């Protein structure tokens, strides 16, 4: 009844991660960040989130190399992510890196029998929200996603 636009769909803890690369030689890998979040999925796509865990993994990559994957996002359900604002401060921060073009790549921990699907989170100014769109093959869209965390572990230009 009236929700039609955007059905709330799960509700959960994010963690995320500036910079995502376990060295080994780094065993303690980076600080992780945790925001909570209200997660609405954008209608079609008949999902199960009590299936999800209450934390998704996720990594902030450049939005410039994921155009690279533009076709495979055709075949994906739609999501969109409202943020419980418990710190403005950490929202702030984010917005600044999201809306500088960077895509948060979302992987779900194990808990399916091979991993899930993959989501990707994409930060809309123009809607003041987060959108994403989730591909059901993991296989390619990590893929593609290994290739962009390669390469900006290649480039390296965080702090």
């Known amino acids: 009844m009236s929700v039609s636009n955007k059905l709330l769909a799960w509700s959960g803890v994010l963690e995320w991660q500036e910079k995502p690369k376990p060295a080994s030689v780094d065993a303690n890998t980076k600080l992780t960040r945790s925001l909570p ?13 009590e299936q ?3 934390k998704l993994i996720m990594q902030l ?12 996002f055709r075949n994906s359900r739609m999501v969109q992510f409202h943020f419980t604002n418990k710190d403005l401060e950490s929202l702030k921060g984010l917005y600044r890196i999201m809306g500088n073009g960077f895509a948060g790549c979302v992987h779900f921990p194990h808990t399916a029998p091979c991993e899930v699907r993959v989501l990707m989170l994409l930060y809309s100014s123009k809607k003041k929200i987060f959108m994403g769109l989730i591909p059901y093959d993991q296989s390619g869209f990590v893929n593609g996603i290994r290739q962009v965390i390669t390469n900006l572990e290649h480039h390296h230009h965080h702090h």
């Open 37 to 49: 979040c209200q997660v609405y999925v954008n209608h079609g796509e008949n999902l199960k989130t």
């Open 52 to 54: 999800w865990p209450q």
């Open 61 to 72: 990559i450049p939005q410039q190399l994921l155009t690279t994957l533009g076709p495979l």
